[model samples]
Target chain A: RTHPMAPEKAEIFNSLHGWFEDNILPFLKPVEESWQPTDFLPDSTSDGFHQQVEELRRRTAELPDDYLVALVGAMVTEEALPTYQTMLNTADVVHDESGASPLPWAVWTRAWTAEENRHGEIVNKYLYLSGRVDMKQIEKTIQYLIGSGMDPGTDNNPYLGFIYTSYQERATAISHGSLGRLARQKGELRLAQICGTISADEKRHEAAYTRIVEKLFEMDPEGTMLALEDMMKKKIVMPSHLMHDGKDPDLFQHFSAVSQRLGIYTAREYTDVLEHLIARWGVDKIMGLRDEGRRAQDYVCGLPSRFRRVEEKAQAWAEKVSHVPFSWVFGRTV
Target chain B: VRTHPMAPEKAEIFNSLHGWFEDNILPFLKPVEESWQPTDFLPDSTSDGFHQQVEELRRRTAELPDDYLVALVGAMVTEEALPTYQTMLNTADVVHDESGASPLPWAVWTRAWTAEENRHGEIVNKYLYLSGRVDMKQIEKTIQYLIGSGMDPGTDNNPYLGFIYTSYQERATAISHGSLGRLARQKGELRLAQICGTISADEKRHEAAYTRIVEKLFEMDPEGTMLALEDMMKKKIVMPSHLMHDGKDPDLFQHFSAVSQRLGIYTAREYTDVLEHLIARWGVDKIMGLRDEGRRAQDYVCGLPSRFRRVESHVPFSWVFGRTV
Candidate 1:
């Protein structure tokens, strides 16, 4: 009887509220569950490695002079500059996608951005302490890199998700390793150890990506294949080119030289990385292909042979130049 | 005093050749002199950071028993691939038309060949160590042979000489490495064996390029080519640069799964003993166009003395094999 006049709409609202309370409220309770209050707060004195790093930074700032520390600082600063640009781009993408109620994605993007921001701060501070790169140039480049804005075509599809993750882990690992090597080369064992620690973190990040791909393979083989195919088809662009403002060529040359010295990613390294992943994923074992996947696999297998054919052609052309007059062509043509 | 008797004739010949040498040969030599070095006689084992890194890598990758070394070596080699390729390209470009010629122009053409050749080292090293499929000594020795066979601008002033040397080197490397694959597969290390097989296929492509270049150069300029060939034939082939660093003899084939002689990669007999078919394919007949000096060089290569012909057999095999008792 009461229900007749009672809230048909009110009941709907109650039911919806109940559903949310029962289903989602429990998950949210941990934030309140762990909450506690303290009567007193400790002073801001540090005691750990981070504290030690800070102390070292202060000490270096106070020292009479040392160019080596400055060099390390500059290198680290340069490295962080790219990450900063990447973070900015990634944040922009996340922001555009996350509409009005975008807090969750925003938090995720912010955490990454904050972490990257710390890298720039630490590196630049170290540079200020030491006197390696002209601070003006470093600041200018950072401005240029960030000011260029986020590049499009970065997130072409889900496969890019895989490729980017894979490459990011690798790139991070290499960067960390390079820093470690440079520190060692400069006879800064403490710096070397610190860089090595960073490298270990990078290794973990790499594992994270590797794990994601591995899980993807297990969970959605077809999806994974499609994603991978999509990534492979879309030319993989290096983040540095878009991020570095107009200084990309110079930056790339320097990076290349450093990479060469470190014996990191080279053309050989690219082939090998591709081969390793292919073998790990058991690409050979992939099935249920109507046409595309098979074609991809075929292309992958033929890569070696195709490379050889190119080499042969180069040799032939080299021979062809024997009859060309040296003086007529020497400096004019590459 | 003797020159005084035919001073005018000798001076005329010397002047013409000298002008040609100054205009062409001297300019070329500048770059070659900067880059060329004697091949190392022994394999390098200094390891630098490679050994330590590899050991740590093995520890970290203990779970994937079959794939550990493959992954490690694959990554390492891939990282170096582009630079190694660049080095080859640079060398090719630098020596392209100079008297000291590369068989090819751009190193890109050698990519497949180089990729294949590279796979041999990577796969075998990984297989032998990572899979526990083969003895480390054997693998090490094979590496020694590989690195000890140092590269240089082959035959003084002969660009084609470098090409011919690379061709033979590629074949030798392929054959030797191929044997390892066959052995690993035979031992039931199928995955490891497959890697070797795949890599060996790459080596063959490289060999084909070298062979093709040799044929092309011989066809285009047989007389000059023959002179370069003869000069290279007289010199002992050097191993890679790593040999000097390690002090390991890379030539012994005894303990190796693949012996150079058995695989036709190369052997004392093979090197000393000329392949008539190859020579013919290289069009040795074109040597007739050579000037007198070139003709003389051709005659020397064709008429290598009995002792010189047996040099390959006579050299001590120092790789995996034992010294002849």
Candidate 2:
């Protein structure tokens, strides 16, 4: 099969150029107005820089293993910035033809990439300064993840691509938001602030992709429905699905399990995301579907409840599972 | 009209070269197990002497000249734009990781190269932040702006032109980093010198990989490869950060490049040297059985470096916070 996209879909994406610029690109904050990673980290140039670092370590010292692992997972995911940007450009029509192209889609991708760059940097610096984890192993995990790469399975199809992004962004927002709330409870206010800031960025990004898919639905309801159904069936895998710490082959699974057990991101929240998207997109209410589209719509409409049931049955099994040692935290069981 | 007409054919050529890439190119990427982490160079924060190590870092970096700091910031900022370069590779329509996790040798090479290149930005960014000589906020802002604004390397989404651009650029970065390391060593900053030297070695491997790819391309499609080399040279290779801006200075890259030139790190002389090296590396003068167009391209490329030898070549403010070198 050709990885290059279909001509008709390409035109459809091209048609939304002005809409992306006017409606979506505005989501990006002006460069001067955006927060830098250093805003949260200690000022290395300050006279009391060492003191600030000491205080930082003192504050973060209380964070538990699961919290640290979840945070590292998030950071590693963001640190693989190269893969995501490259993934976005795979859609033939959505790509930035020239690196400096002013095409609205191109601008959106670059600006979005720039915005996301801070998330990784902030978390990386925070983790590094805390000295609570084995950063060498953590750094190696990021390298392996980026090297192994990830497949969102969009096949360069813009409809499927945006749907995948819409789902992933909201999932990220939920995870970060939950992690931030946990940090606050643990009395790490700075960590909470950082997570909140990053979550807010994900929220904005989610809105942009959600709207793009919404527009795609308006332009081609049947095709959009099929794409959405296809993605829902394929399932939205984490961006860091291929992550490993060079030693543990099951590192991603263990980290994810910790995230689940810690209530950072779980099956319930996963279903919550889908339920929210189903309602937001008005899946049941969308009209004029062909037989296939109608089938796709019906399949997606009942998916949340079905997912909830499956997760509910697995709850007992999940609790019975034991914690695994993570190299990120120097072989501590999280 | 959305995709290039020649994209499919170009992709086929990449497919044809996959086996060769697996054997020659993939080996260039060092295994992550053996790779050095940023913390390996920086003092481990977990260590009891973390404060002492950071203080020592500041002390050594204190000797770095303002111009040197400016040049290093420029390099670091350029490295931080990793997303752009990876995206550029995918945009080339050939040599792209189709599945993101594609098993194609070309695809593996792209991701592996990206994974290795990722460290350059991370280590340098951390080093600069810890150095305490440069302003982190302004440097961070510049990085944010550069990644957002993106850059144009004049390849225009053509893999032939794209590889040529990378081959030239990888060498340029090696030269610049190597020179910067020497300066650091001369300034009694052995730590900083080690960091620069390590990064230079990585770039050198990357340069070798890209040059080999181009050499193989020459063997496969002599005319098209020759034309692409001449084409990129004619356009004059653009730095990946050519479009970088720091909000206030419209000529941020220009000023930064000037600092490099003034320091003799990367100059017009270096650019000419890179071109000549590439020409000789590809054995441009030895190609035969070329059509008129191919012959023209060959002549142009062979004669181009000497012409460049005839030519000759930053600022302050945000990155340095009102300090001029």
Candidate 3:
């Protein structure tokens, strides 16, 4: 017999439908309102365009090596968004079962993905214009990453998927925000503006994910707590964890560590994000928690202190190994 | 209790068929080094001759008519909707890859196919953008709206139906590109012709691949498979690009098809031809030991092409703006 649709799950997203339209729907900028990649990039059709391209390459050359690695690694992650969109559709409760469903979740996922699509294209166009980067080597990584696919191991559980996205979006925003600063520091205001634009979208996306999880907690404190605990326990893996740049087993690890060393994204930032999430969800004072969930609340509430108190050699390890040559920057060592 | 997302038995059967695919067809795909990149075809921006090569491309593209441009844009828009197609394929129960990162054959095939498909849009769109004649921003607007409004292709996630749709769609792409290539050649756009030809060859390989898998499915479950082929026929294969709106005009697809029809890129005859081709390729007459329904499905299949040929009336289509082809 077909299992009847769970009324509670129905009611869960049903309640969210209102908040989504009123609040989260506003986050998405309509196509007309949104900026095109063409707005920022140089005109390809214009006269003497090759000269414009030379200017781009020369400007990119002026930026230091670490900046390119961090930016390209992020772009590599963004370009693998076909996999990310797939994972979003695979999420529990928020699943877009019908590829063209009329549900708010479906609308949000599609629009958000389209918005994120620009992130990849703009950065890619910039890199392409730079002409000093390895287009072929970097392009292979995008194919491999997509072929590798992504699984947060959420088990079709909406709560876990929601929380995973929450953490991920925040992480990206922070990374982008940090990169935006680095871009300005290098006297490449255009790079800073490009990164800043991307980070702005990430900010909105993080809020959307946060709101979904926020309401989930409000509905079923125990269930959401349990999923949060499970998600934290499993640990969030970046979508491009399996990415290979045609060479090096340590490619993603090496890239991420460089991000860490560059202060783009660090272990401290991760712990602080958890603390922020726990406080945002009010996990400390969540009502109607059973024994198991209460214990989860305890672990998470105390989690921030545990991380901040204990300092490891991770930062030092990241610092020492920051001398690798990246293929993206014409094989220049940072 | 939390429900098991998919049935265990279903998983086993699906996994087995997917494994068979992995072992048989995985080697059919090209290696990364063997594959070509869009940059290979595009004018080298860093080269000293960049301006000359780009001017050559622009001059060649200048000869392409408005109709061809619209249709080419439609093709690029369709190819760019990669995410929707992947999600749709994942939903097919025959190879429901539970984990996005599953090592299953279905997952592998989906990624590999999408990766290959990715190059189509990248090359096509870049060429169009660099061509200097088209409205690039207008093209970008269509991509935005198309992705926002996704496709459902009427499959309902059945593998039999899914494969049937894929087989038909892949052949349709091959025809579309092949025709485009022919027209490009006539117009003296050698680079555009070569690009479309390369893309056409890829689609042909993919067409064979999907047709082979569906034939295997027919071998496994004759009665059910026969019914599925009939069901998809009744449902009518809708193009994923049907939802394409260019921000303002809702009939952008019809505009695209008018060009496609007039140019003989994709037409009624090709539709009938593909159906006939699939019937013969599947060896539909040889499948036996069927129930009454299966027999009827076979008869329907046998009769489709001729019936399609008998369509006598051609209404003036509105894609050409007041003047119909």
Candidate 4:
């Protein structure tokens, strides 16, 4: 006999078809209306192109070592979007049958992939122009990360996948927003604007994922809560866990330490994202739950405080973590 | 009542090929440590010779035709839309990577293949931007639009359909890239030629991998595989970037293809060449034990090259604005 949950989830996804068009689809700006990486980068075809490049290098020179580590780390995450897109399609009952399906999920996936594609290219172009990092080493990291691939451990479960994306987009938005502030502080207004722009896109993406999960909560609170609890137990794995810069075995960890130390993204923000999600979904107030769901609801409701308590210990350990030499920053310690 | 039902047993067949992919296909994917990056081909901004190299590149590209730019842009956009292809590959039931990072051989092959293919667009897009012959903004917009409007290759997410489509598509890419390399060399752009040639080599290896995969499938179930091959050939192999738009023209792909056809980068002749090559490579005419539908599909598959060769569009691409190629 076929499992009942998958078919139920499929129905829920289809039922929200019109809702997706109204809510999620609007988050994606049409190609014509969107910004291109070309808008920000110095035009090679322009007469003053040489000077423009020199100025870019000069401006980027002021950014601190850890900022490059944090920025490049984030950029690598963005660059490995092929894995992310594939992961999205693997979700049960939500996969795009045709590459160009007219379904809401398919349309959303394609457009979102398109928009995110620019994030990688622009960051890459900017880094290349800056002459601050080892482009070859950095490029190898991208190659390895994509080649090795990433597992969020969602098990192709849409509920777990949706929640994971919701958490991740908010995390990225926070990190990018912090990077933007750092860029402005360092006098690189162009870089600041770029980060701010990326952060805005992430914010919109976070909203879409958050709202989708919110709707699922309303329709199937029991299964949704169980998935939430299961995912929390699994611990949302960052998509860049497999990142290697050819030299370091622990490149992702070392990079995460740098980001954590720099306050670009930290334990505190992770807790905050969970709390924000809980409040938004109203997990505490969700009614009509079974015994298992009620138990999951209690666990989910208490997670914010649980994570907050852990953050206190994490903060102390993070401050004393050794700064490692990053290949992305030409072996500079960050 | 159904007559001549030759069930392909796709899940079983695909599951059995995991070891085949591990041994055959995975080896085709180059190690990341030894891989060539976009920076290796591009002018290093940090180097003192950066300006001179850019100037030289621009000079070399200046003499190239607008038609060539459109063709290159079409290839670049096709390559840039990498996510759609990976997603499509994962849509096939048993052949897909269950987890994104599964250690399963099929999953490994898919990820590794995508990793290698990712470099094509990066190198080309950067090369074009540095060459400064075409409009970068318009080219970027086209990439954005292409990824948004993914291709419809009529595969229906079946592994057989998917594999056959990829087998043909990869070969076609290799041909197109190889032609581009020759065109560049003829134009005396040695660096660009080398870049194009390097990309062509990757595609060639990829083509071999996919071809061998379909050949393996044929070995397992010739009749069913024949029907699939014919099905794809009948529906036709549409290029992944057929729906590519520059945000202005409704007939953007037609304009791009006209340029490609005019330049002989990728044309009807080349398409027939790929078809004939696949037929011979797969030993289509040598397959045996076919019922009526299977026999008809076999004949159709074998005769398609000649029919296609016997049978057979133009606009200005916004990529090279105001120029008619």
Q: Give the proportion of true interface contacts each model preserves, from 0 to 1.
A: 0.00, 0.86, 0.49, 0.87
Query: For candidate 3, what is the TM-score?
Result: 0.93
lDDT of 3 by residue, B205-311 (tens): 88988898888867877787788788788777788888888766777777677767877877989887888889889988889678898999989988888788889
Q: Please give the range of 10 consecutive residues that has the lowest summed lDDT in model 4 chain A.
A: A1-10
Top of the candidates by TM-score: 2
The Cα error of candidate 3 at residue B87, in Å, is 0.7
Q: lDDT tens digits, residues A241-327, model 1?
A: 432312333453344443443454444455555566667776667777657667766665556566566656755673322111111
Write down the TM-score of every candidate: 0.35, 0.97, 0.93, 0.96
Looking at model 2, residue A252 earns an lDDT score of: 86
Q: Which stretches of candidate 3 lie above 4 Å from their native place?
A: A1-11, A312-319, B1-13, B312-325
What is candidate 3's CAPRI-style docking category based on DockQ? Answer: medium
Q: Model 1, range B55-130, lDDT digits (tens) per residue?
A: 3433333343222222223222222122122223223312321111122232223322232232233333332233
Each prediction's DockQ against the real complex? 0.01, 0.80, 0.56, 0.80
* TM-score for chain B of each model, two decimals: 0.53, 0.95, 0.91, 0.94
Q: lDDT score, residue B297, model 1?
A: 76
lDDT of 2 by residue, A237-310 (tens): 99999999977899888889888878977888888888888888888899999999999999999898898779
Q: Is the docking of candidate 4 incorrect, acceptable, medium or high quality?
A: medium
Better of 1 and 2 by TM-score: 2
lDDT of 4: 0.85
> What's the C-alpha lDDT at position A233 in model 3?
75
* Docking level for model 2: high
Order by lDDT, highest first: 2, 4, 3, 1
**1 against 4, candidate with superior lDDT:** 4
- Displacement of residue A211 (Cα, Å) in model 4 is 1.1
